[PDB]
Design an enzyme around this catalytic site. Structure first.
Site, PDB file in Angstrom:
ATOM      1  N   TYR A  29      12.718  10.234  27.790  1.00  0.00           N
ATOM      2  CA  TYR A  29      13.565  10.114  28.914  1.00  0.00           C
ATOM      3  C   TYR A  29      13.573  11.486  29.690  1.00  0.00           C
ATOM      4  O   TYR A  29      13.481  11.476  30.897  1.00  0.00           O
ATOM      5  CB  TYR A  29      14.965   9.843  28.464  1.00  0.00           C
ATOM      6  CG  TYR A  29      15.995   9.880  29.498  1.00  0.00           C
ATOM      7  CD1 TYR A  29      16.220   8.804  30.327  1.00  0.00           C
ATOM      8  CD2 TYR A  29      16.834  10.987  29.621  1.00  0.00           C
ATOM      9  CE1 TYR A  29      17.229   8.817  31.240  1.00  0.00           C
ATOM     10  CE2 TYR A  29      17.844  11.010  30.575  1.00  0.00           C
ATOM     11  CZ  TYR A  29      18.051   9.964  31.370  1.00  0.00           C
ATOM     12  OH  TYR A  29      19.061   9.926  32.318  1.00  0.00           O
ATOM     13  N   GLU A  41      27.814  19.221  35.219  1.00  0.00           N
ATOM     14  CA  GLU A  41      28.151  18.407  34.055  1.00  0.00           C
ATOM     15  C   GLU A  41      29.634  18.451  33.976  1.00  0.00           C
ATOM     16  O   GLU A  41      30.219  19.555  34.010  1.00  0.00           O
ATOM     17  CB  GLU A  41      27.525  19.064  32.809  1.00  0.00           C
ATOM     18  CG  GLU A  41      28.179  18.669  31.498  1.00  0.00           C
ATOM     19  CD  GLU A  41      28.081  17.172  31.188  1.00  0.00           C
ATOM     20  OE1 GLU A  41      26.937  16.662  30.925  1.00  0.00           O
ATOM     21  OE2 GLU A  41      29.154  16.494  31.284  1.00  0.00           O
ATOM     22  N   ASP A  87      21.134  12.394  35.555  1.00  0.00           N
ATOM     23  CA  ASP A  87      21.083  12.152  34.147  1.00  0.00           C
ATOM     24  C   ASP A  87      22.500  11.817  33.637  1.00  0.00           C
ATOM     25  O   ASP A  87      23.144  12.648  32.954  1.00  0.00           O
ATOM     26  CB  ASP A  87      20.515  13.337  33.435  1.00  0.00           C
ATOM     27  CG  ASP A  87      20.429  13.130  31.961  1.00  0.00           C
ATOM     28  OD1 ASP A  87      20.613  11.988  31.514  1.00  0.00           O
ATOM     29  OD2 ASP A  87      20.159  14.063  31.222  1.00  0.00           O
TER      30      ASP A  87
HETATM   31  C1  LIG Z   1      24.241  14.016  27.820  1.00  0.00           C
HETATM   32  S1  LIG Z   1      23.759  13.278  29.317  1.00  0.00           S
HETATM   33  C2  LIG Z   1      22.549  12.094  29.039  1.00  0.00           C
HETATM   34  C3  LIG Z   1      21.810  12.061  27.704  1.00  0.00           C
HETATM   35  C4  LIG Z   1      20.338  12.407  27.842  1.00  0.00           C
HETATM   36  N1  LIG Z   1      20.261  13.651  28.598  1.00  0.00           N
HETATM   37  C5  LIG Z   1      24.913  12.329  30.218  1.00  0.00           C
HETATM   38  C6  LIG Z   1      25.978  13.247  30.853  1.00  0.00           C
HETATM   39  O1  LIG Z   1      26.521  12.755  32.060  1.00  0.00           O
HETATM   40  C7  LIG Z   1      27.835  13.383  32.156  1.00  0.00           C
HETATM   41  N2  LIG Z   1      28.627  12.749  33.173  1.00  0.00           N
HETATM   42  C8  LIG Z   1      29.203  11.527  33.175  1.00  0.00           C
HETATM   43  N3  LIG Z   1      29.835  11.333  34.320  1.00  0.00           N
HETATM   44  C9  LIG Z   1      29.650  12.487  35.048  1.00  0.00           C
HETATM   45  C10 LIG Z   1      30.072  12.902  36.285  1.00  0.00           C
HETATM   46  N4  LIG Z   1      30.839  12.047  37.000  1.00  0.00           N
HETATM   47  N5  LIG Z   1      29.723  14.146  36.727  1.00  0.00           N
HETATM   48  C11 LIG Z   1      28.958  14.985  35.993  1.00  0.00           C
HETATM   49  N6  LIG Z   1      28.555  14.594  34.820  1.00  0.00           N
HETATM   50  C12 LIG Z   1      28.933  13.362  34.337  1.00  0.00           C
HETATM   51  C13 LIG Z   1      28.365  13.140  30.755  1.00  0.00           C
HETATM   52  O2  LIG Z   1      29.455  13.943  30.372  1.00  0.00           O
HETATM   53  C14 LIG Z   1      27.186  13.450  29.912  1.00  0.00           C
HETATM   54  O3  LIG Z   1      27.147  14.750  29.290  1.00  0.00           O
HETATM   55  C1  LIG Z   2      21.072   8.509  29.780  1.00  0.00           C
HETATM   56  C2  LIG Z   2      21.620   7.200  29.280  1.00  0.00           C
HETATM   57  C3  LIG Z   2      22.818   7.233  28.533  1.00  0.00           C
HETATM   58  C4  LIG Z   2      23.349   6.036  28.033  1.00  0.00           C
HETATM   59  C5  LIG Z   2      22.707   4.794  28.264  1.00  0.00           C
HETATM   60  N1  LIG Z   2      23.227   3.643  27.759  1.00  0.00           N
HETATM   61  C6  LIG Z   2      21.532   4.761  29.013  1.00  0.00           C
HETATM   62  C7  LIG Z   2      20.969   5.967  29.499  1.00  0.00           C
END
Ligand SMILES: C[S@@H](CCCN)C[C@H]1O[C@@H](n2cnc3c(N)ncnc32)[C@H](O)[C@@H]1O
Ligand SMILES: Cc1ccc(N)cc1
Ligand SMILES: C[S@@H](CCCN)C[C@H]1O[C@@H](n2cnc3c(N)ncnc32)[C@H](O)[C@@H]1O
Ligand SMILES: Cc1ccc(N)cc1
Lengths: 281, 281
Positions: free
Chosen positions: A62, A107, A156
């Site tokens: 990913y 984040e 992401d």
């Molecule tokens: C860890 S990450 C994805 C997993 C693979 N990289 C997904 C992140 O999106 C953030 N997230 C969710 N909503 C938001 C918003 N609204 N803004 C910034 N980040 C967000 C959440 O806290 C996760 O750490």
């Molecule tokens: C980045 C990512 C996190 C959660 C799911 N369900 C799909 C994609």
């Protein structure tokens, strides 16, 4: 030994599970339930609101596709924004590009970063890079306020249930469009074609209201539901995100495990039924 | 409501589950444990030795790719063999081709057929077709004895644990090669790239000992482990199975839900790490 199971109304009637070697850390942050465990076979795993976010076994798929699809199409990307992405995987991939001068990450949950620096040192190693700047905020707000424009925005995010709710609506796509350079691109996590067609149609229609080319690509990754996740792919030019403009040949990319030049365009050849659902949007 | 869970040493540390609306039928046949249940969201499901074989929701992906990849590359396929495949899904897809004159199916477990005729009438409807002939036998033996050669052989087997054990070895690939026309092709189910690299390397090395082109394609399908399954693709000519020789345009194919001309070749663009593992075989 116990198992972790991923149940959700977002995928009713189905569930994926991983066996737990040891729980490493759990907390309730300001925004979400955070769980980190060493699985028996997928290495360490990060879970948020009961949903798997990454495992050390497969995250490269990913991280590499969400990063290198747009970063090989963007000609000389200088400034890049990761939305979400607190684990740092996208940053790691971004740092390999010597030409990048700045990487902003917005984040919402600083707990995710800190846990990642502690528990996921090969995913979070890019935070040491002098070009990385961190913003702890809702990206929906960050993008309402940021003065800079970006060459690429990589969204992401987690799923629409939880703090990512603000990221899956027509408004968020307007903000993204505004925050990108005129020839800038955005890729976003856009769920599974097997079960989330309503969502995919909605997001596509949101993106098509602004962008002149909106494409959808699919990634195989076993620890997201249905074993795939899509990349909603937004281009301001007619040309889109299906064909890379370079190959990754310097020593920094010798380590790549999923992405390459061919499987970049392959990812956009979708199942028949999906094409038919989205054709009149 | 209870759930069905798919645990196996073939994928240790992980499991997929489906919620059960009602159990429809169970039996121990001569060869395997047979389970049929209506799931809440994936329609009816067939399980053999605790492993999911198909669901009504997604079977078209695997049936369409395993069938139409080779049947669009074969120029005028007259005679086709399905190994395994008792559900009839591959037959159904095959019947759409007016040019086919004969379809032999060698399925070791007649219980699978009968259950499919009873419980899966839209998968098993091709058994009414006057061109279909059924052989209830171990394909390993059928192929030692059959006098005819085939234009295409589709190996729609279960996993190596159970009666399909005889289908995943160098010997079986010799038999297949012998049973194909000189320009004949074979496609076979060849497991998941995320966890079965040892097996994939073995099968590839088996196929490469005989065939001059051996390719591997990947299908997204959520109800097999890791959400994908590969097609081991064996060609006696240098040209292989990556490019279709026709398009499916007659009224019989208007119903197709996964396969099309482009995603045929896309399926063969594999992840970097997989290419590197298999490059010195
Ligand atoms: C860890 S990450 C994805 C997993 C693979 N990289 C997904 C992140 O999106 C953030 N997230 C969710 N909503 C938001 C918003 N609204 N803004 C910034 N980040 C967000 C959440 O806290 C996760 O750490
Ligand atoms: C980045 C990512 C996190 C959660 C799911 N369900 C799909 C994609
Ligand atoms: C139902 S089918 C696959 C599900 C999607 N079509 C798998 C079949 O392979 C048969 N099978 C397994 N081993 C063999 C051998 N050795 N020979 C013939 N058929 C076999 C098994 O009984 C299933 O019905
Ligand atoms: C056809 C088939 C593919 C994979 C598994 N696990 C079972 C059956």
């Amino acid at each position: 030994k116990k198992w972790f199971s991923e149940f959700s109304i977002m995928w009713p009637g189905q569930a994926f599970s991983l066996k737990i070697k040891k729980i490493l850390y759990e907390t309730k942050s300001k925004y979400q339930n955070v769980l980190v465990f060493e699985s028996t076979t997928y290495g360490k795993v990060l879970v948020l609101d009961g949903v798997i976010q990454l495992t050390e076994k497969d995250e490269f798929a990913y991280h590499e596709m969400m990063t290198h699809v747009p970063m090989t199409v963007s000609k000389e990307p200088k400034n890049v924004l990761v939305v979400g992405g607190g684990d740092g995987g996208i940053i790691r991939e971004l740092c390999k590009y010597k030409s990048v001068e700045n990487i902003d990450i917005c984040e919402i949950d600083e707990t995710v970063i800190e846990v990642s620096k502690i528990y996921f040192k090969n995913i979070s190693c890019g935070y040491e890079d002098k070009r990385v700047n961190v913003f702890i905020e809702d990206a929906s707000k960050f993008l309402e306020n940021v003065t800079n424009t970006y060459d690429v925005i990589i969204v992401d995010s987690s799923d629409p249930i939880g703090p990512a709710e603000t990221l899956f609506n027509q408004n968020f796509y307007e903000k993204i469009y505004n925050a990108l350079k005129p020839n800038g691109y955005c890729v976003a996590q856009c769920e599974s074609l097997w079960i989330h067609v309503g969502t995919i149609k909605n997001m596509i229609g949101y993106a098509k209201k602004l962008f002149k080319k909106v494409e959808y690509a699919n990634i195989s990754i076993p620890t997201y539901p249905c074993g795939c996740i899509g990349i909603l792919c937004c281009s301001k030019t007619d040309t889109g995100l299906t064909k890379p403009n370079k190959k990754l040949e310097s020593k920094e990319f010798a380590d790549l495990k999923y992405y390459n030049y061919e499987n970049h365009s392959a990812a956009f050849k979708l199942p028949a039924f999906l094409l038919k659902e989205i054709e009149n949007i």
